[PDB]
């Protein structure tokens, strides 16, 4: 089967910003890595899949944004959509 | 790096390659992987924030699987996104 990527080092960096004194067990980190791999593959899936069904040559932030609101429930989407636009607003500027 | 310039811990370059894997003929704008990296960093921060609170509430200094469960199973939106 398919190989998952390892996001542990980046999950750990995020943990230190939200809980600097708190560690994480190996098994708990493995669960986080599977969550991150699962959401990456789901959002990236519909963005590639919206660009090919809407006759678009390029995957942009607006396929990610649409996919995020297709898959994420309620306030998670709005906040994720908030955080996504602010990131490209530092990036483009 | 492109990830610092977006204010992110998650690697933008890796998300770019992940997006290109879905269709090697589909091109990837610069905004797409930055936006997606920030979305996953937010979701990661949200789970760890709540799981870290569960660890602290139980007088623990590290997150264990039970803390992830307590955090997600008691959050309707996370439990229904992650299962």
């Amino acid at each position: 089967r398919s190989r998952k990527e390892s996001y542990s080092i980046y999950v750990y960096k995020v943990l230190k910003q939200v809980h600097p004194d708190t560690g994480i067990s190996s098994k708990a980190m493995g669960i986080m890595n599977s969550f991150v791999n699962d959401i990456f593959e789901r959002i990236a899936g519909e963005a590639s899949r919206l660009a090919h069904y809407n006759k678009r040559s390029t995957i942009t932030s607006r396929e990610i944004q649409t996919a995020v609101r297709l898959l994420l429930p309620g306030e998670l989407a709005k906040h994720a959509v908030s955080e996504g636009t602010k990131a490209v607003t530092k990036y483009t500027s | 790096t492109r990830s610092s310039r977006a204010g992110l811990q998650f690697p933008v370059g890796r998300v770019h390659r992940l997006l290109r894997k879905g269709n090697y003929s589909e091109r990837v704008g610069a905004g797409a992987p930055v936006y997606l990296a920030a979305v996953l960093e937010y979701l990661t921060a949200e789970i760890l924030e709540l799981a870290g609170n569960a660890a602290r509430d139980n007088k623990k200094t590290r997150i264990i699987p039970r803390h992830l469960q307590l955090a997600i199973r008691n959050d309707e939106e996370l439990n229904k996104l992650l299962g």
Partner: peptide, 18 residues
């Protein structure tokens, strides 16, 4: 028997960056 097929915390080592 929790030690036979349950979660044992003392066997779940800390995740280590370095």
């Amino acid at each position: 028997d929790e030690d036979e097929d349950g979660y044992i915390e003392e066997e779940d080592e800390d995740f280590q960056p370095e």
